[PDB]
Design a binder for this molecule. Structure first.
Ligand code: ATP
Ligand code: CA
Ligand code: CA
Ligand code: CA
Lengths: 168, 371
């Protein structure tokens, strides 16, 4: 720690809505003119920042999961959410938003109504009668007898390759 | 620069490359040493074997498991496993790769330190990190809040997690898992007249377990069906072509998860420990836990277990609760997949413990950086 990512540096600095899309294990801002138009094959992270009368900022973090998003995208959205909350000193309330089941609050961020569209960025992932036990045991042993040891092994010698730490 | 992810369990190593969607190497977490065969050996001989080989040669080896109930207890043999994993399964030079390791819930402080120490001093990794297994599984399911049921070969945990972090005071550990279920299935098959009790036969018992066992939705009803008809029986072909028949052993075996007294353990079953864990958490977050019960690990793979858990938790919980059980098909690897995703993030680069940080601070840095 800390995360030094450029988008973290921008996150929650002033009141407003910020949206990022998970793209190949990164958090990439969504162009503001496309806010509200969600690819159902993707996952997003949304930060709503609100000015409190006490001068502080209030934070709600929503991670939105499209029906067709890949496991790397949904997992990354969840992790980025934790990381952003921690960066914001734990003050953000976290919300999981699933396509078709979003909270009233999330839906309310989008005054023209959020819309879905198919597609998205590609995943970042790169009988025989009574049991005759003696017969079974003989078979198993025959199978075992025929097993040959691997000859290609790097042997473990307990060699230490790194530097031994000494307290000062 | 590619990071490695190693998820070390009681029974199986899952190891691979960050960014891949599955571990490239999955193999028994065992070291085997030859049994006496009538003559004293006889040196220059391979005096030890690891993983797949050890398993194949089990008939003439004594096997040791360095991890017991998810905790590393034999450090010498653990180092052997790690060495074998790097050099002989992944075929990499560890000094070239940041390495993400996993740990059990409530892993002792001294253990986390020794893992750190070994990675840097033995294997000279350039960087490393240690993550909690259940938390990785939760992340893999695309959640920051839920309660994980993680059940493997040696240990079962209930781990409640809120907004990204486990709640340690509410974690429950049960030393009952897949190996106990295999032992139990061996016992009740012996009861039926099939005595699969030697090490040579052990893999047959595990295979029957993984292929034919299931959790009954209503156990005692199921027992009555099995007594009243042959409708639940299955034939099973042994490696020598012999065919055996099994009946109520199919669902008696994993019933043990719900009724540990079947193998003489006094513990509550996994539905009760799940409930007890939730009840140790703040009332205000319980609703979120009930709605996000995530199953992880190979011993959660029994058909019917999710529905059975859904039923039992529903009976225990206030009627006002939305109960949901999440059981991904890939859940034998959900810990590993979560690690793969985490170690791949653009934001993860500064989270690693670097060699330099270690060389300056020593093993205790793990408590501050891996948290
Ligand atoms: N389909 C299946 N049905 C029942 N059990 C299964 C199935 N597949 C795997 N298992 C069991 O899962 C266990 C291995 O799972 P896993 O890799 O999660 O455990 P581990 O990480 O080695 O152990 P632990 O987490 O306890 O330390 C074994 O007992 C194995 O027999
Ligand atoms: Ca996508
Ligand atoms: Ca928070
Ligand atoms: Ca495990």
């Amino acid at each position: 720690m800390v995360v030094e990512h450029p988008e973290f540096l921008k996150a929650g600095k002033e009141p407003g809505l910020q949206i990022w899309r998970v793209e190949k294990f990164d958090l990439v801002p969504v162009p503001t003119n496309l806010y509200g138009d969600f690819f159902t094959g993707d996952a997003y992270v949304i930060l709503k920042t609100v000015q409190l009368r006490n001068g502080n900022l209030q934070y709600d973090l929503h991670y939105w999961l499209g029906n067709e998003c890949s496991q790397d995208e949904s997992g990354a959205a969840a992790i980025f959410t934790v990381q952003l909350d921690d960066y914001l000193n734990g003050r953000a309330v976290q919300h999981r938003e699933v396509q078709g089941f979003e909270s009233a609050t999330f839906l309310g961020y989008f005054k023209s109504g959020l819309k879905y569209k198919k597609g998205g960025v590609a995943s970042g992932f790169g009988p025989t009668g009574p049991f005759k036990r003696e017969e079974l045991l003989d078979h198993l042993e025959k199978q075992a007898k025929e097993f040959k040891d691997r000859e290609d092994l790097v042997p473990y010698t307990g060699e230490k390759r790194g530097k031994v730490w000494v307290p000062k | 620069t590619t990071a490695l992810v190693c998820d070390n369990g009681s029974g199986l190593v899952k190891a691979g490359f960050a960014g891949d969607d599955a571990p490239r190497a999955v193999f028994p977490s065992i070291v085997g040493r030859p049994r006496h065969q009538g003559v004293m050996v006889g040196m220059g001989q391979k005096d030890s074997y690891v993983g797949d080989e050890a398993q194949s040669k089990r008939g003439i080896l004594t096997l040791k498991y360095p991890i017991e109930h998810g905790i590393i207890t034999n450090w010498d043999d653990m180092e052997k496993i790690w060495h074998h994993t790097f050099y002989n399964e992944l075929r990499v030079a560890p000094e070239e790769h940041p390495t993400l390791l996993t740990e059990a819930p409530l892993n002792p402080k001294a253990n986390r330190e020794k893992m750190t120490q070994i990675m840097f001093e033995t294997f000279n990794v350039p960087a490393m990190y240690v993550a909690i297994q259940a938390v990785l599984s939760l992340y893999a399911s695309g959640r920051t809040t839920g309660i994980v049921l993680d059940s493997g070969d040696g240990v079962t945990h209930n781990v409640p997690i809120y907004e990204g972090y486990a709640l340690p005071h509410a974690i429950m550990r049960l030393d009952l898992a897949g190996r106990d279920l295999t032992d139990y299935l061996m016992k009740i098959l012996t009861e039926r007249g099939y005595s699969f009790v030697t090490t040579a036969e052990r893999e047959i018992v595990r295979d029957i377990k993984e292929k034919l066992c299931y959790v009954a939705l209503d156990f005692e009803n199921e027992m009555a069906t099995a007594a009243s008809s042959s409708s639940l029986e299955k034939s099973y072909e042994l490696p020598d072509g012999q065919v055996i028949t099994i009946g109520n052993e199919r669902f008696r075996c994993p019933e043990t998860l719900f009724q540990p007294s079947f193998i003489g353990m006094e513990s509550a079953g996994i539905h009760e420990t799940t409930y007890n864990s939730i009840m140790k958490c703040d009332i205000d977050i319980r609703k979120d836990l009930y709605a996000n019960n995530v199953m992880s690990g190979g011993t959660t793979m029994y058909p019917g277990i999710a529905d059975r858990m859904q039923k039992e938790i529903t009976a225990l919980a206030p009627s006002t609760m939305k109960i949901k059980i999440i059981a991904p098909p890939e859940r034998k690897y959900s810990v590993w997949i979560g690690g793969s995703i985490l170690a791949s993030l653009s934001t993860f680069q500064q989270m690693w413990i670097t060699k330099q940080e270690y060389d300056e601070a020593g093993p205790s840095i793990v408590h501050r950086k891996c948290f």
